[PDB]
Ligand SMILES: *[C@@H]1O[C@H](CO)[C@@H](O)[C@H](O)[C@H]1NC(C)=O
Ligand SMILES: *[C@@H]1O[C@H](CO)[C@@H](O)[C@H](O)[C@H]1NC(C)=O
Ligand SMILES: *[C@@H]1O[C@H](CO)[C@@H](O)[C@H](O)[C@H]1NC(C)=O
Ligand SMILES: *[C@@H]1O[C@H](CO)[C@@H](O)[C@H](O)[C@H]1NC(C)=O
Ligand SMILES: *[C@@H]1O[C@H](CO)[C@@H](O)[C@H](O)[C@H]1NC(C)=O
Ligand SMILES: *[C@@H]1O[C@H](CO)[C@@H](O)[C@H](O)[C@H]1NC(C)=O
Ligand SMILES: *[C@@H]1O[C@H](CO)[C@@H](O)[C@H](O)[C@H]1NC(C)=O
Ligand SMILES: *[C@@H]1O[C@H](CO)[C@@H](O)[C@H](O)[C@H]1NC(C)=O
């Protein structure tokens with residue numbers, strides 16, 4: 302990347318800011334901005350690129366061959382019983398949460414068994430998380 | 437990427453801002469902005485690219501060959517009983533949540549077994565998460 | 572990367588800021604800004620790149636061959652019982668949370684068994700986490 306910006310409230314290249322309950326009198330603002338931006342990004346000069354894959358099997362005997370890729374999720378149990386018995390009782394459940402396997406962002410590239418790759422891979426995440434807000 | 441911006445409230449290249457309950461008197465604002473932007477992004481000069489895949493099998497004996505790709509999700513159990521028994525009781529369930537496997541964003545590229553890839557892969561995520569808000 | 576910025580509230584290249592309950596009188600602001608930015612990023616000059624993979628099997632005997640990739644998640648149990656018995660009782664559950672395997676951001680590149688890779692891999696994360704807020 303080049304420029305990544307996270308700003309909580311206010312972003313301003315030039316800010317003449319006046320807030321509340323203010324007396325703004327006899328003001329002379331003079332501004333000159335000569336701003337130049339020149340970007341040359343991701344320039345490639347390749348005369349020749351070779352990607353080569355060769356597989357040869359000759360009068361061979363192969364048996365019981367197994368190949369398994371990544372993220373092999375097998376025999377997984379989630380068990381969340383909730384047994385609530387009541388007798389002459391007062392429950393005030395204002396904000397009660399039961400969350401299981403709650404994803405927000407899942408991003409995947411190039412999850413393989415055999416990969417031959419040339420170039421650029423980029424991931425950017427910006428956010429504001431706020432799970433529970435009980436006023 | 438080049439320019440990624442996250443701004444909570446206000447973005448302004450030039451901001452002459454006046455808020456409430458303000459007296460703005462005798463003001464002379466003079467502004468000159470000579471802004472130039474030049475972008476040259478992702479320029480490629482290839483004289484020759486070869487991607488080559490060759491497979492040869494000759495008088496061979498192959499048996500019990502197994503290939504499995506990624507993300508192999510097998511024999512998975514989710515069990516969330518909720519047994520609520522009641523007897524002379526008062527329940528006030530204002531905001532009660534039971535969430536299982538709640539995704540927001542799932543993004544996938546190039547999830548394969550064999551991949552030969554040239555170029556650019558880019559993922560950008562911007563958001564504001566707010567799961568529960570109970571006033 | 573080049574420029575990564577995290578700002579809590581306010582970002583300003585030039586800020587003439589006046590807050591509340593202020594008397595702003597007899598002001599002469601004069602500003603000249605000659606700003607130049609020149610970026611040359613990720614320039615490659617390759618005359619020749621070779622990526623080569625060759626596999627040869629000749630009159631061989633192979634048996635019981637097993638290859639397993641990364642992230643092999645097997646035989647995993649989550650057990651979170653919640654047994655709440657009640658008798659002449661008052662419960663005030665204002666903000667009670669039961670969270671299991673709660674992800675926010677999961678990012679993956681190039682999770683393979685065999686990888687041949689040339690170039691750039693970049694990951695950027697910016698956020699503000701706030702799990703529980705009980706006023
Ligand atoms: C504002 O400027 C003018 C001219 O410069 C001047 O006559 C005036 O008195 C100023 N304001 C005050 C409140 O003095
Ligand atoms: C910018 O503006 C001011 C305002 O008077 C001027 O004096 C100056 O010569 C200007 N410069 C450029 C580079 O534009
Ligand atoms: C890429 O193109 C030619 C190839 O040799 C080279 O002379 C030139 O300087 C390169 N371009 C840049 C912007 O560097
Ligand atoms: C391996 O081969 C034997 C017999 O040759 C067979 O019983 C077994 O199931 C095989 N295992 C796999 C994983 O293929
Ligand atoms: C505003 O400016 C004019 C001319 O510069 C001036 O006559 C006037 O008095 C100023 N305002 C005040 C409130 O003084
Ligand atoms: C910008 O505007 C000001 C206003 O008077 C002027 O003096 C200056 O010469 C200008 N410059 C350019 C580069 O436009
Ligand atoms: C790509 O085109 C030619 C090929 O050699 C090269 O001379 C030129 O400089 C390159 N373009 C840029 C913008 O670099
Ligand atoms: C492997 O081969 C044996 C017999 O040769 C067979 O019983 C078994 O099911 C095979 N396993 C697989 C995974 O193909």
Ligand SMILES: *[C@@H]1O[C@H](CO)[C@@H](O)[C@H](O)[C@H]1NC(C)=O
Nearest residue numbers: 326327328462596597598599
């Ligand atoms: C503001 O400036 C003007 C001219 O410079 C002047 O006459 C005036 O008295 C100033 N304001 C005050 C409150 O003195």
Ligand SMILES: *[C@@H]1O[C@H](CO)[C@@H](O)[C@H](O)[C@H]1NC(C)=O
Nearest residue numbers: 331333335601602603604605
């Ligand atoms: C910037 O502006 C001031 C304002 O008078 C001027 O004196 C100066 O010559 C300017 N310089 C450039 C480089 O623009």
Ligand SMILES: *[C@@H]1O[C@H](CO)[C@@H](O)[C@H](O)[C@H]1NC(C)=O
Nearest residue numbers: 344345346611614615616617
């Ligand atoms: C890449 O292109 C040619 C190749 O030799 C080289 O002379 C040139 O200086 C390079 N470009 C840059 C911007 O360095």
Ligand SMILES: *[C@@H]1O[C@H](CO)[C@@H](O)[C@H](O)[C@H]1NC(C)=O
Nearest residue numbers: 364365366367634635636637
């Ligand atoms: C290995 O081979 C034996 C018999 O040759 C078989 O019983 C066993 O299941 C095989 N194991 C695997 C992992 O393939």
